[PDB]
């Protein structure tokens, strides 16, 4: 229907429905084919996924990540449903080339976790038009996902888009705090970094990842780390105003504080 | 056996062929000259062989709950990746569309 003030595997428990945006009504219409939006209703296994993905998407937009039009609608059972505008559909019924990193590296749905962040860098170097520019946001995207507890960034959640004959990392999609959504969360990262999926430290992100693997200079890293420092106040304000329940909000803030303390954000 | 047209943004690009045993082969049409079906398949080569279902075409299939929704809508086996691809080929994530030849 219509939106409201929102203008191993984990994702395989939530529906991904196609929908068109009605011209006059402004409401959504779920269709089987030829849709321009993706609708994600509530999951009967993990709680508050639409409200989780909605606020996490807005947090990514605050730190400067390319985020498409997203929001929340009211389902027919009066529950909240998340929607996102597809960036592989661009009006006049035209399409854009979109390929995920499992297709680009020879993997499939069953082995979408059998990779590494170092292989993710290799794909970007091989196919992107400006690999140096893409490494800057891959650093920002990986830092963001670690801070908001997104531990489901497998190969199918990274995608390359071809827009105006320029090949770059697609806008953000499938970004949510998946750590608070489950119990007994096993990993902090979906793909290992420096052979590590848990207990990752500041030197793993800012030294091995940012300097040795991505080739960013110190002033670029310091500017991005400073960017995350000034966004913590606004991040806590947006979460408190989100549509998450108070119990889900407290789990979000506690996990955000824990990851910030690990990266020495408060000292 | 089973063959399927592979189009890019409406324009027919090539043919994906189920081959004997378990192999698969994609062949670009000589006329085609736009954008590649996949970045792993540049136009400089016209023929691509695979020992399994190619990973690009496997990446267009549904996943998780949406795969169970497909398997209860169609009379198709859960491991028939080529058959499932033909059922959804009219609309997938990329600019690529598949239509069966038979
Ligand atoms: Cl560059």
Please explain how this structure is put together.
The complex is a heterodimer of chains A (267) and B (102). With 267 residues, chain A is of the alpha+beta class. Chain A is 39% helix and 14% strand. Chain A is built from eight helices and eight strands. Chain A has a five-stranded antiparallel sheet with strand order 2-1-3-5-4, covered by helices on one side. Chain A starts with 16 loop residues before the first strand and ends in a 5-residue tail after the last helix. Chain B is α+β, with helices and mostly antiparallel strands and 102 residues long. In chain B, strand 1 and strand 2 form a beta hairpin. The N and C termini of chain B lie close together (9 Å). The A-B interface holds A 9, 11-16, 18, 33-35, 88, 94-100, 102-109, 127, 156, 160, 162, 167 and B 8-9, 35, 38-40, 53, 55-56, 58-59, 61, 63-66, 69, 90-91, 93-95. The site of chloride ion has 4 residues of chain A, from helix 4. The PDB classes it as toxin. The entry lists the keywords toxin-antitoxin complex, legionella pneumophila, structural genomics, Center for Structural Genomics of Infectious Diseases, csgid, National Institute of Allergy and Infectious Diseases, niaid, toxin. It forms a dimeric assembly.
Question: Summary?
Answer:
By secondary structure, chain A is α+β, with helices and mostly antiparallel strands.
Provide tags for this entry.
heterodimer, A: 267 residues, alpha+beta, Phosphatidylinositol 3-kinase Catalytic Subunit, Chain A, Domain 5, 2 domains, 39% helix, 14% strand, globular, B: 102 residues, 5-stranded antiparallel beta sheet, 3 helices, 19% helix, binds chloride ion
């Amino acid at each position: 229907h219509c939106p409201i003030t929102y203008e191993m595997s984990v994702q395989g428990v939530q529906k991904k429905l196609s929908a068109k945006l009605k011209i006059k009504e402004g409401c959504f219409e779920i269709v089987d084919q030829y849709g321009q939006y993706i609708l994600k209703p509530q999951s009967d296994i993990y709680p508050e996924l639409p409200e989780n993905e909605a606020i996490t998407m807005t947090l990514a937009k605050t730190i400067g990540l390319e985020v498409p039009v997203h929001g929340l609608v009211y389902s027919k059972d009066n529950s909240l449903t998340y929607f996102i505008k597809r960036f592989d559909r661009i009006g006049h019924n035209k399409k854009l080339a979109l390929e995920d990193f499992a297709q680009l590296s020879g993997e499939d749905r069953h082995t979408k976790y059998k990779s590494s962040m170092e292989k993710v860098i290799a794909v970007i170097e091989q196919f992107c038009t400006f690999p140096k520019i893409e490494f800057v946001k891959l650093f920002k995207l990986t830092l963001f996902n670690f801070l908001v507890g997104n531990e489901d960034m497998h190969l199918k959640n990274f995608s390359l888009i071809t827009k105006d004959r320029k090949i770059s990392i697609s806008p953000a999609y499938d970004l949510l705090n998946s750590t608070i959504a489950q119990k007994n969360t096993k990993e902090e990262l979906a793909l290992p970094l420096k052979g590590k999926k848990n207990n990752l430290t500041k030197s793993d992100f800012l030294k091995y990842f940012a300097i040795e693997k991505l080739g960013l200079n110190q002033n670029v890293i310091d500017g991005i780390v400073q960017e995350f420092h000034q966004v913590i106040p606004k991040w806590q304000e947006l979460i408190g105003f989100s549509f998450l329940s108070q119990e889900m909000q407290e789990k979000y803030l506690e996990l955000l504080e824990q990851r910030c303390k690990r990266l020495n954000f408060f000292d | 056996m089973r063959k399927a047209y592979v189009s890019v943004s409406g324009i027919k690009a090539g043919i994906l062929e189920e081959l004997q045993g378990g192999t698969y082969q994609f062949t670009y049409f000589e006329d085609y000259h736009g954008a590649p079906v996949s970045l792993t398949m540049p136009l400089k080569n016209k023929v691509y062989d695979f020992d399994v279902f190619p990973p690009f075409f496997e990446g267009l299939l549904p996943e998780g709950i949406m795969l169970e929704a497909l398997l209860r809508k169609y009379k198709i086996d859960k491991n028939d990746y080529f058959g499932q691809l033909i059922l959804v080929g009219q609309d997938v994530v990329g600019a690529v569309t598949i239509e069966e030849i038979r």
